[PDB]
Amino acid sequence: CPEGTNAYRSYCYYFNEDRETWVDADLYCQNMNSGNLVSVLTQAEGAFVASLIKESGTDDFNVWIGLHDPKKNRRWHWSSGSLVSYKSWGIGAPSSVNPGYCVSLTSSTGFQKWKDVPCEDKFSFVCKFKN
């Protein structure tokens, strides 16, 4: 994987401290590497991604991942199109009361759990791409 990015099981990943909307972040991932916002497909991959973010030294609270609810009916999809083989919702997520339609990793959980937030929030983000 290229400098600045880290390999994990066939893919390359990187944390970008640029705060963007969920949409723009995902586009960034597509443009720079023909990747997407990270899909977290196993517990082990979530552990890897959490450690990647922590190693950066960031003090951010929320980091985008590629999960969103495109029809606002709480049917979640990865932007990369992967199946949802793994879920790691934090306490009280996803909210049915104040639903957000995009998903972030939360520093309060070591970036191991997810929270649904407004897609128009500007958070840092992790990209995942092949090669």
| Neighbour count for residue 89 (Cβ, 10 Å) | 14
3-state secondary structure the chain: CCCCCEEECCEEEEEEEEEECHHHHHHHHHHHHCCEECCCCCHHHHHHHHHHHHHHCCCCCEEEEEEECCCCCCCCEECCCCCCCCCCECCCCCCCCCCCCEEEEEHHHCCCCEEEECCCCCEEEEEEECC
Q: How far apart are CA 47 and CA 40, in angstroms?
A: 9
Which residues lie below 8 Å from residue 54, measured CB to CB, with a gap of 6+?
Answer: 110, 111
CA terminus-to-terminus distance, the chain: 6
Which residues lie below 8 Å from residue 91, measured CB to CB, with a gap of 6+?
Answer: none
- The residue range of the domain holding 45 is 1-131
Q: Are 36 and 66 in contact (CB under 8 A)?
A: yes
Q: Are 55 and 98 in contact (CB under 8 A)?
A: no
* Amino acid residing at 11: Y
Which residues lie below 8 Å from residue 130, measured CB to CB, with a gap of 6+?
Answer: 10, 11, 12, 35
Q: How many domains does the chain have?
A: 1
CB hemisphere CA count around 25 (13 angstroms): 32
Q: Tokens for 4? A: 């600045």
The CATH number covering residue 62 comes to 3.10.100.10
